[PDB]
Ligand binder design. Structure first.
Ligand SMILES: *[C@@H]1O[C@H](CO)[C@@H](O[C@@H]2O[C@H](CO)[C@@H](O[C@@H]3O[C@H](CO[C@H]4O[C@H](CO[C@H]5O[C@H](CO)[C@@H](O)[C@H](O)[C@@H]5O)[C@@H](O)[C@H](O)[C@@H]4O)[C@@H](O)[C@H](O)[C@H]3NC(C)=O)[C@H](O)[C@H]2NC(C)=O)[C@H](O)[C@H]1NC(C)=O
Ligand SMILES: CCCCCCCC/C=C\CCCCCCCC(=O)O[C@@H](COC(=O)CCCCCCCCCCCCCCC)COP(=O)([O-])OCC[N+](C)(C)C
Ligand SMILES: CCCCCCCC/C=C\CCCCCCCC(=O)O[C@@H](COC(=O)CCCCCCCCCCCCCCC)COP(=O)([O-])OCC[N+](C)(C)C
Ligand SMILES: CCCCCCCC/C=C\CCCCCCCC(=O)O[C@@H](COC(=O)CCCCCCCCCCCCCCC)COP(=O)([O-])OCC[N+](C)(C)C
Ligand SMILES: CCCCCCCC/C=C\CCCCCCCC(=O)O[C@@H](COC(=O)CCCCCCCCCCCCCCC)COP(=O)([O-])OCC[N+](C)(C)C
Ligand SMILES: CCCCCCCC/C=C\CCCCCCCC(=O)O[C@@H](COC(=O)CCCCCCCCCCCCCCC)COP(=O)([O-])OCC[N+](C)(C)C
Ligand SMILES: *[C@@H]1O[C@H](CO)[C@@H](O[C@@H]2O[C@H](CO)[C@@H](O[C@@H]3O[C@H](CO)[C@@H](O)[C@H](O)[C@@H]3O)[C@H](O)[C@H]2NC(C)=O)[C@H](O)[C@H]1NC(C)=O
Ligand SMILES: *[C@@H]1O[C@H](CO)[C@@H](O[C@@H]2O[C@H](CO)[C@@H](O[C@@H]3O[C@H](CO)[C@@H](O)[C@H](O)[C@@H]3O)[C@H](O)[C@H]2NC(C)=O)[C@H](O)[C@H]1NC(C)=O
Ligand SMILES: CCCCCCCC
Lengths: 197, 165, 176, 176, 176
């Protein structure tokens, strides 16, 4: 019998460190403002990169179906995490580009995302003359109407910011917990002290 | 315009074609007597995507032209838009008329950019009816040529026999 | 103002991932050492991930508004006054109705201009963060690359095998 | 599972607004991820031509799904950026997409000497302002149409993804 | 042939105006496609270190060409969004790129109580409009400079692609 322990430094580097960085990126995208338009780029490029790592790893994993190696479970975890980052970035961008002309803000969104959460997340925010006078009155009324429209736009954008920060914290927590629960499961796989033989 | 993502789509399709080229290169023999059909078609679609990247770049250049950079001529518009298809009161009045003049100037510049945009859309529709035809015809010719490459009827052309039991 | 910072950086990281892929299928899966090239790949991928994080911070600052953020005097002192100097950066009811209406228009226009002024200050803060990150990273990138690849280029073999043997084991100069 | 994720994400570009210049980014990057995964697949599964397996049927279904997603996305972007100067909204489109489907939904949050020069200028300004308001109303109607279409297609594509992963993997799975 | 396509596109990005946030997208995607093509080259090309082949010189050439295009693209983009508030156009910039070069560019086809507060507010509006028009003229000068540089580099890079696909493949092709 030959009880042999593997030295995974190669796999550590070539698959785990890149995935650590990708998972970092999948948390950052929630720190980005939707006004940039660089959010989908980040999220979906991270997904493409973890797909590249999957390709890398294809030619190096046993093709047996009695179990899934912790490495492929970790890669699928990061892949689904990036997927959910994409979904939630889409949601944030939807909320950010919402307006009264398209959406009516309900009361549960308002309550949750403007009253309850922001404290936790630390955000807290004579004919000619007659014509001329009527024209200037029209201008002023248009400007005040647009001010109200912008106020509602800003309420939607604040909802988006709050959801973004909540998702940031949630994703940091989830990624960290899963990564460390997978790495601890892997560090406690040590050959027995007696080989039973 | 910013957000349309023409070049994004085009160049990403080129990237996908490059990946497909890498995938095919893992499957074709390494002989240099004839070019196979799938590699020929990959080259064709890559050339087509290159030309369409060029066209998108040109349409973005034309649609985004301004009086500061380029002058729009009567002949260009006719070739595209017409053929192919007291001291206080004195201060008050001065300020008001200056405001109106500035507004008018801004809006006229806007109209000029709009004309450029429509020129671009016209070029775009024409270039589309050309690209659809080109790509479809290339694809179809190549692949029906493949479909028509069928084994002869006789094992030896001249020999009338089938050489079968 | 060009939505191309994160695109640039993350596409660079994708290229680096491709190079990592090409490298992974050139060496054996041994664990007695990290290959110099894999060392450099990890270093540079981490540095580019940091570049991406920094560009994200810069964008966050750039796109702040009085409606969502406050321009603390500390941040002004830091990223508009002090560091730029260090980094060496470049620089009759009807008539009454009409009167009240023009006054309201002026009020709103002044508010909008204050808004835009604070937005410009946030943008300058972003530019300062940007030059800082440049002057901190670009040297690091260049110097780490040079360090690694001279440490690699200066790995000539020992010029004499069998450490405790002055003999060169050469056909030219035998011993006896 | 990766092909499932790609399908699910293709059924999602329809919750991504068009004011966000990122729909093509998302869709075509899903397509790129699926192409790299096509590489993976060809490396893993067999190159048999005896028949079309389930992996192949599902991959081609997913690819056609992404292509249809991209095509309808382009249609939506073209409707959204449909200028009123050159396109007047039909009446059937307004009756269906603005007036019927919004209500047919319940789950959504959608809606349902000199002085004469001064007078001349202010009147010009107001006239131009109301013209701009009319153009904006038309453009917003187009945006609303595009958003309604997007919601519809979101539902449709999520449903297709579900019934597809079930159909392509039901006949045999129950037999097992 | 793919290297030819990539070099042509590299030279091509310089006809794309910065107004469209897609110069970096285009250049960097050309770079990504060329990196994937390096990936296939590594599989179809000998992995020997005795000499640089002709294809290897050509590949390195097109890669440096793409990368230089990206760098100069960044410089152009910055020259575009070069605000007057922080940078002032020097003398050589408006002497070469505005008074000399546009004149020797033939393939260009480019240009060569409360009543009192009311009047005070109108005057403030005029003040802000004047200052904004001045700053806007400055920004337009910067944009014109960027456009001229972009045209110059378009020409330079097309010519470099020509002489590069000819040089690398001329001496050998005449020995034949
Ligand atoms: C798949 O590939 C195979 C080849 O591997 C193809 O087979 C070829 O098919 C051709 C057409 O059926 C054949 O052409 C016919 O060849 C025969 C025989 O030719 C040989 O003998 C000739 C006569 O020799 C005498 O006379 C000479 C001149 O006076 C003297 O020098 C010699 O000593 C003798 O006294 C000779 O002249 C010739 O050079 C050959 O040695 C001819 O009789 C027919 O007229 C040819 N034409 C036809 C219509 O048959 C060809 O020979 C044959 N090659 C082989 C290797 O069998 C097959 O067709 C392919 N199937 C496909 C593509 O589907
Ligand atoms: C970082 C630099 C911090 C910049 C300052 C900043 O605005 O941080 C902001 C958040 O700060 C964070 O939440 C940290 C997020 C950093 C991005 C991490 C991504 C990589 C993930 C790696 C894993 C602070 O927010 P604020 O708006 O200042 O808080 C309002 C406080 N107030 C209500 C009293 C006003
Ligand atoms: C957010 C989305 C969560 C994704 C969950 C996930 O994908 O788990 C992935 C792994 O992940 C793990 O096994 C690590 C365990 C961490 C728990 C996940 C966090 C839950 C909340 C924390 C607070 C699933 O991996 P898989 O590819 O399905 O593995 C095959 C399993 N099979 C053999 C049963 C098929
Ligand atoms: C889908 C149905 C399209 C509905 C019509 C439509 O929106 O056309 C859009 C195309 O938007 C596209 O993306 C067309 C996709 C066609 C691609 C070529 C495949 C079919 C080729 C074989 C075919 C916009 O097209 P348009 O230029 O705005 O057309 C004028 C519409 N008008 C008549 C109302 C002015
Ligand atoms: C994630 C997408 C969510 C989504 O689109 O929600 C929307 C559509 O919701 C639908 O029409 C549901 C479509 C299927 C969603 C995925 C189901 C997977 C099983 C919900 O309706 P909305 O008016 O688009 O948004 C309301 C506010 N909200 C999005 C915060 C709920
Ligand atoms: C070197 C080529 C320089 C060149 O021709 O650029 C020109 C073409 O620009 C293009 O058409 C795009 C680049 C295609 C060049 C083809 C490769 C030549 C080798 C520059 O294009 P333009 O000057 O902006 O257009 C002017 C239009 N006019 C010719 C009617 C005035
Ligand atoms: C490595 O593999 C070998 C062979 O598969 C393992 O040896 C086998 O271990 C099992 C479980 O301990 C033995 O079965 C048990 O043996 C004891 C002996 O006292 C008996 O009392 C139990 O009732 C049961 O039969 C088996 O005999 C033994 N030998 C073989 C060849 O199977 C070995 O345990 C493995 N080592 C590790 C680290 O897993
Ligand atoms: C190439 O590899 C060979 C071995 O395959 C090396 O020769 C051996 O090197 C080892 C380690 O230096 C020597 O062991 C040492 O021996 C001395 C003297 O007893 C002792 O003081 C040290 O503590 C150590 O144990 C070994 O003697 C030597 N010889 C053989 C045949 O193994 C050789 O050095 C390598 N050359 C190079 C340039 O790497
Ligand atoms: C007194 C007229 C002010 C004009 C303001 C114009 C706002 C667009």
């Amino acid at each position: 019998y030959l009880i042999i322990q593997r030295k995974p430094l190669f796999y550590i580097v070539y698959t785990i460190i890149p995935c650590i960085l990708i998972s970092i990126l999948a948390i950052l995208v929630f720190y980005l403002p939707p006004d940039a338009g660089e959010k989908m780029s980040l999220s979906i490029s991270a997904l493409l990169a973890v797909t590249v790592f999957l390709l890398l790893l294809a030619d190096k994993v046993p093709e047996t179906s009695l179990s899934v190696p912790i490495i492929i479970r970790y890669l699928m975890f990061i892949m689904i995490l990036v997927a959910f980052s994409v979904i939630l970035s889409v949601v944030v961008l939807n909320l950010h580009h919402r307006s009264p002309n398209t959406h009516t803000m309900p009361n549960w969104i308002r309550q949750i995302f403007i009253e309850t959460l922001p404290p936790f997340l630390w955000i807290q925010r004579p004919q000619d003359l007659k014509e001329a006078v009527e024209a200037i009155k029209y201008i002023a009324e248009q400007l005040e109407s647009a001010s109200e429209f912008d106020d509602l736009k800003k309420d939607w954008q604040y909802v988006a910011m709050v959801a973004d920060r909540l998702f940031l914290y949630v994703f940091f927590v989830i990624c960290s917990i899963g990564t460390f629960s997978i790495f601890l499961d892997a560090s406690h796989n040590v050959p027995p002290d007696n080989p039973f033989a | 315009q910013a957000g349309g993502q023409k070049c994004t789509l085009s160049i990403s399709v080129l990237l996908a074609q490059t990946i497909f080229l890498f995938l095919i290169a893992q499957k074709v023999p390494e002989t240099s007597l004839n070019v196979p059909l799938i590699g020929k078609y990959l080259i064709f679609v890559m050339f087509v995507s290159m030309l369409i990247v060029m066209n998108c770049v040109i349409v973005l250049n034309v649609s985004l032209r301004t009086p500061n950079t380029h002058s729009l001529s009567e002949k260009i518009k006719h070739l595209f838009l017409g053929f192919l298809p007291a001291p206080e009161i004195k201060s008050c009045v001065e300020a008001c008329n200056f405001i109106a003049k500035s507004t008018k100037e801004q809006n006229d510049s806007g109209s000029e950019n709009e004309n450029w945009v429509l020129i671009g859309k016209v070029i775009d529709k024409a270039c589309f009816w050309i690209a659809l035809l080109l790509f479809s015809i290339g694809t179809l010719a190549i692949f029906l040529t493949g479909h028509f490459n069928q084994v002869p009827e006789f094992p030896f052309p001249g020999d009338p026999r089938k050489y079968v039991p | 103002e060009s939505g191309e910072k994160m695109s640039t950086a993350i596409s660079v990281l994708l290229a680096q991932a491709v190079f990592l892929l090409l490298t992974s299928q050139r060496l054996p899966e041994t664990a007695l050492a990290v290959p110099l090239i894999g060392k450099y790949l990890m270093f540079i991928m981490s540095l580019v991930t940091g570049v991406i994080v920094n560009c994200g911070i810069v964008l966050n600052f750039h796109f702040r508004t009085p409606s969502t953020h406050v321009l603390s005097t500390r941040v002004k002192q830091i990223f508009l006054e002090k560091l730029p100097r260090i980094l060496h950066m470049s620089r009759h009811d009807e008539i009454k109705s009409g009167i009240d209406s023009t006054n309201y228009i002026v009020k709103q226009i002044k508010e909008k201009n204050a808004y835009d002024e604070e937005v410009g200050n946030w943008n300058l803060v972003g530019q300062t963060i940007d030059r800082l990150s440049m002057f901190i990273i670009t040297p690091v990138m260049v110097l780490g690359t040079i360090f690694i690849f001279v440490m690699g280029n200066f790995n000539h073999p020992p010029a004499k095998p069998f450490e405790g043997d002055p003999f060169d084991y050469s056909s030219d100069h035998p011993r006896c | 599972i990766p092909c499932l994720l790609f399908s699910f994400l293709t059924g999602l570009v329809f919750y991504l607004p068009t004011d966000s210049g990122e729909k093509m980014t998302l869709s075509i990057s899903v397509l790129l991820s699926l192409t790299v995964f096509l590489l993976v697949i060809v490396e893993l599964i067999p190159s048999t031509s005896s028949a079309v397996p389930l992996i192949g049927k599902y991959m081609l279904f997913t690819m056609i799904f992404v292509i249809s997603s991209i095509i309808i996305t382009v249609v939506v972007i073209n409707t959204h950026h449909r200028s009123p100067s050159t396109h007047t909204m039909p009446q059937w489109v307004r009756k269906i997409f603005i007036d019927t489907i919004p209500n047919v939904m319940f789950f959504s949050t959608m809606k349902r000497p000199d002085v004469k020069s001064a007078i001349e200028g202010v009147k010009y300004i107001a006239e131009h302002m109301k013209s701009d308001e009319e153009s904006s109303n038309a453009a917003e109607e187009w945006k609303y149409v595009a958003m309604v279409i997007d919601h519809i297609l979101l539902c449709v594509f999520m449903l297709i993804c579900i019934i597809g992963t079930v159909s392509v993997f039901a006949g045999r799975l129950i037999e097992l």
